Amino acid sequence: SEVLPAGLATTVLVPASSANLGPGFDSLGIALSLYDEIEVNTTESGLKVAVEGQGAGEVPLDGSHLVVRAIERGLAAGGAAAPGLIVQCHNKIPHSRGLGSSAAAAVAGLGVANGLLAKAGRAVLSDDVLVQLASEFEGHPDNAAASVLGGAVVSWSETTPIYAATRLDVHPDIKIVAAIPETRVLLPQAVTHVDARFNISRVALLTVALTARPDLLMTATEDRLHQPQRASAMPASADVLAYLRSQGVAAVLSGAGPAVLALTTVDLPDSAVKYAEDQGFSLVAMAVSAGVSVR
Amino acid sequence: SEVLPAGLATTVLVPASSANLGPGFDSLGIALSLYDEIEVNTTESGLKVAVEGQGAGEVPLDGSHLVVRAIERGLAAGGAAAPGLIVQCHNKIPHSRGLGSSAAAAVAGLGVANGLLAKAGRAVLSDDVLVQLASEFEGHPDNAAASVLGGAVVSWSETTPIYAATRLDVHPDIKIVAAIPETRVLLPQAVTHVDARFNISRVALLTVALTARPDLLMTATEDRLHQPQRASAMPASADVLAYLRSQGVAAVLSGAGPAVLALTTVDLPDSAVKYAEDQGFSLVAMAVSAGVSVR
Ligand SMILES: Nc1ncnc2c1ncn2[C@@H]1O[C@H](COP(=O)(O)OP(=O)(O)NP(=O)(O)O)[C@@H](O)[C@H]1O
Ligand SMILES: Nc1ncnc2c1ncn2[C@@H]1O[C@H](COP(=O)(O)OP(=O)(O)NP(=O)(O)O)[C@@H](O)[C@H]1O
Ligand SMILES: [Cl-]
């Protein structure tokens, strides 16, 4: 496979994302305006990884770094190989918080591949290929499709599993606030038909509430297939979630938590802001973001 | 409650509907341009019921008739009562075929009440109340909401159960063909979490496919929670369903069957039309309908 020239550079901006959004377990995701920025240069030989910000000192500084793995996977998919790499990460996406830092790193590395391929005069990978490859790193497509495509996404799989997604236009009156604090619960293998039908009606309603009917966000963010089962092992997230919802705020777990996402139609009460902080949660307002950007 | 004057008349036209539409079990429905016509007059006393067409000779002609039940429930909800009634039905919605004749009957009777209330100068029942009351007759809101609201609907329940729905704007390139023939199974009590996540991703996708991306109808109409389990008890429906999908036609069970619905953007293959007929099914082309009409 054609070895890339040395001396190419590209910079990538990848957003955080929040999966599930209540009942949309393993399918729904939404891209948020909190970014990691990755700058990469091709060189004659070797690999240097530098990391500043979130996860600094917690991520590997070698070829096992998720971004580097994704760079190499994307290049291979594009029929190329890097002669050598310098990789600099400026991270603002918190790790292990439910905001999709692993998915963003894979999407970023694949974005870097598209940047390097283009500047070498080669074909880039289509968004569908980006979604496929990023989801393979995660094992499920919801965060990955969100970081690739932006907006809100409906993702799905076909079973070598195929991963795909489509982008929704989030209603402009919906504003997202993330409550971010400072092992995974085993989910039931089987669920009642009644509970499955419940989530079916709610996730179907959720795509409508995200796009056309923001007044239905409370009803559409109800869930019976993962949030109640996770509550006892993460009481403070469950407590903040319960409090926001009791105040009419459409609150959901950000993925598996512990962060909590509020899909708001009016600004949060000062009381709710104070309640979250008392539990240890910082409230960060975020806009729905576009997908990964490459230049 | 105010007794209505004798001598009022109203005519109601109610569409059939198709529930589930694949993975949207107990939530999704779509209104079809196949109508029952109900003419009602208030009289000094008594109850006279005449029925023509579908269901003629099999439905009760007394106060237990579903339309009459719905008229009186609606009038009572409207704070009124009929001194006497003449009810004549011209039915084209086949019964016991998966095309929502029971829900259509309740919606028609409730529409009749709104017609009589209006001509008596009283407030009519809101669409939300119509959906609530019709769904109470059915035990589920998907057929009822479709017949009330028209178009495609996402319906849901909250727990006296609350039944509600919201109307989707079906993509104009989507045209419906019903395979209508001339059997009972108890669905499984539990389903795997895996199968629930599957239907979750597909029903979320279906709302997008019905409204913006009809090219996704095949993927979005896949189901694991009721259609495969109903195949054995309705072999000919399952065969027509399986064959249409094998030919690239987004086919689903109409409700619980035995009718089969094709969600098409182009007319059916010359061959598939013949395969359905060979299996005993008449293929009827239908447009998405508006809701119940009252005059
Ligand atoms: N930006 C990153 N760069 C490199 N490796 C990363 C990065 N983010 C995550 N990882 C790897 O994944 C680990 C954290 O994984 P994880 O707990 O899934 O966090 P997350 O994906 O950001 N949040 P969550 O939604 O809770 O899964 C790190 O210790 C790394 O091994
Ligand atoms: N238009 C109608 N007028 C009066 N009674 C009706 C009408 N439609 C259905 N019924 C009653 O409902 C019975 C048949 O119910 P059924 O056929 O199971 O309902 P359905 O709504 O057509 N079911 P499905 O379309 O298969 O989901 C009849 O024997 C009547 O008692
Ligand atoms: Cl906790």
| DSSP per residue, A97-156 | SSS-HHHHHHHHHHHHHHHHHHHTT-PPPPHHHHHHHHHHHHTSSHHHHHHHHBSEEEEE
- Amino acid occupying residue B36: D
Where do the domains of chain A lie?
A: 1-169, 170-295
Six-digit token pair at B268? 């059916």
Q: How many CB atoms lie within 10 A of CB A211?
A: 19
- Please tell me whether B84 is known to bind a ligand: no
- Distance of CA B294 to CAs B16, B74, B108, Å? 15, 14, 9
> Cα B246–B225–A17 angle (5° rounding)?
95
Q: Which of A12, A15, A53 is nearest to A178 (CA)?
A: A15
Which of helix, strand or coil describes residue B10? strand
- Amino acid occupying residue A158: E
Q: Which of A146, A137, A128 is nearest to A28 (CA)?
A: A146
Task: Write down the experimental method used for this entry.
Answer: X-ray
User: Alpha-carbon distance A145 to A130, whole Å?
Assistant: 8
Residues 63-92 of B with CB under 8 A from A: none
Radius of gyration of chain B (CA): 19
Residue A232's Cβ-count burial label (10 Å; 0-12, 13-18, 19+) is: exposed
Residue A216 DSSP class: G
The answer to whether B6 touches B46, Cβ cutoff 8 Å, is no
- Distance of CA A79 to CAs A44, A112, A144, A252, Å? 18, 14, 22, 41
CB contact (8 A) between residue A191 and residue B191: yes
Q: Is A214 in the pocket of ligand 1 (CB under 6 A)?
A: no
The answer to whether A29 touches A114, Cβ cutoff 8 Å, is no
CA pseudo-torsion sign A262, A264, A267, A270: negative
User: Alpha-carbon distance A155 to A179, whole Å?
Assistant: 24
Q: Which of B194, B279, B212 is nearest to A225 (CA)?
A: B194
The answer to whether B260 touches B251, Cβ cutoff 8 Å, is yes
The answer to whether A144 touches A137, Cβ cutoff 8 Å, is yes
Residues 202-231 of A with CB under 8 A from B: 202-208, 212-213, 216, 219, 225
Chain A residues closer than 8 Å to B188 by CB: 193
The answer to whether A91 touches A52, Cβ cutoff 8 Å, is yes
Tally C-beta pairs within 8 A across A and B: 113
Q: Pairing state of beta strands B175-180 and B282-286?
A: antiparallel
CA pseudo-torsion sign B273, B274, B278, B284: positive
Residue B189 DSSP class: S
User: Alpha-carbon distance A282 to A262, whole Å?
Assistant: 12
CB burial of B236-263 (b: ≥16 within 10 Å; e: otherwise) equals: bbbbbbebbbeeebbbbbbbbbbbbbbb
Six-digit token pair at A137? 């790193």
User: Alpha-carbon distance A92 to A77, whole Å?
Assistant: 28
User: Alpha-carbon distance B127 to B131, whole Å?
Assistant: 6
User: Alpha-carbon distance A162 to A174, whole Å?
Assistant: 31
- Start-to-end CA distance of chain B, whole Å, equals 23
